[PDB]
Design a protein around this ligand. Structure first.
Ligand SMILES: Nc1nc2c(c(=O)[nH]1)N[C@@H](CNc1ccc(C(=O)N[C@@H](CCC(=O)O)C(=O)O)cc1)CN2
Length: 308
């Protein structure tokens, strides 16, 4: 069928490539503008194949569909919209235009963790199960009926990057392909998201990823890994904003005070700079080990090297 891909990044690119190689006609690609001479991988792949590429900075203005970009989108005659990591709300004029409507990839088990940072909040909350959903776009935000859903286990030391690379990206690409295949045969279902279990969390940015030291070690662990690598959990140390990466929960070594003590504004007790990284304490007296640190305008350095 004729497909318009509305999205961005490598995930969008791979979904594009896989749908193309299943024989679908990509009549158009709608991604984000170039940033600093960097072209989105989805736009790069499509232009190569000779597929129309659009880079609208926005779809709506004054809470109303921009008619010119709606007309440019309509022109390619999509029979189905596919939205692999689309960062903006798409007007219903566009969503409802194709014969088959529009499907969206969401990296959480909907209705849980609606929102733009679902993977982060999966880990911040300490969820044991994660996964992705393919759902039909409607007029709300991540509220549309489910087409298919796939689960995976969340590992205790998973960060955003590890669970994305291991499962959410590669199985997500397959999920989108399978969904399009189900639509092509008319078998794709529409399961209304249940009320029970619906949550929504705000997008994670640097501003709201600051660490709260007054939790048990496990909760701090979840916060750090839930924002690793982006946008990076951080806290003030020595009047510097320091970001934390590569947290693992730790039983031993205890203490061992073989490491070098580091005072941290607001922590339950002093951290420890050790051979294997920065040991931090939660208010339960238990430990997590942070392997990598980062200062404002700087490359990552090992936690072991904080003083050096
Ligand atoms: N029709 C329709 N269009 C959609 C979706 C939909 O379900 N229905 N789902 C969208 C994907 N999911 C989200 C969920 C939350 C946000 C979000 O909250 N973005 C912040 C970004 C904040 C920022 O970057 O500064 C905002 O305020 O716009 C964006 C896409 C794709 N477009």
């Amino acid at each position: 069928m004729k497909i318009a891909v509305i999205g961005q990044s490598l995930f969008g690119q791979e979904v594009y490539k896989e749908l193309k190689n299943e024989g679908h006609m990509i009549v158009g690609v709608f991604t984000i503008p170039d940033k600093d001479g960097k072209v989105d991988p989805l736009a790069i792949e499509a232009e190569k194949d000779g597929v129309p590429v659009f880079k609208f900075p926005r779809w709506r203005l004054k809470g109303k569909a921009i008619t010119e970009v709606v007309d440019q989108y309509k022109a390619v005659g999509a029979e189905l919209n596919v939205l692999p990591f689309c960062s903006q709300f798409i007007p219903m004029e566009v969503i409802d235009h194709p014969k088959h409507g529009s499907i969206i990839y969401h990296p959480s088990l909907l209705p849980r963790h609606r929102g733009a940072s679902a993977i982060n909040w999966t880990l911040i909350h300490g969820d044991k199960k994660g996964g992705f959903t393919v759902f039909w776009a409607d007029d709300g935000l991540d509220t549309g009926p489910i087409l298919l859903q796939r689960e995976c286990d969340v590992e205790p030391n998973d960060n955003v990057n590890s669970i994305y690379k291991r499962f959410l990206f590669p199985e997500g690409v397959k999920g989108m392909v399978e969904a399009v295949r189900l639509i092509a045969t008319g078998k794709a279902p529409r399961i209304k998201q249940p009320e029970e279990g619906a949550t929504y969390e705000c997008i994670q940015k640097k501003e709201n990823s600051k660490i709260d030291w007054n939790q048990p070690a496990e909760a701090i662990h979840n916060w750090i890994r839930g924002n690793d690598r982006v946008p990076g959990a951080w806290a003030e140390i020595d009047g510097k904003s320091v970001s934390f990466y590569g947290s693992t929960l730790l039983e031993n070594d205890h203490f061992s005070s073989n490491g070098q003590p580091l005072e941290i504004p607001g922590a339950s007790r002093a951290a420890l700079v050790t051979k294997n990284g920065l040991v931090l304490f939660g208010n339960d007296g238990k430990m997590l080990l942070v392997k990598n640190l980062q200062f404002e305008d700087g490359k990552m350095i090992p936690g072991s090297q904080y003083f050096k």
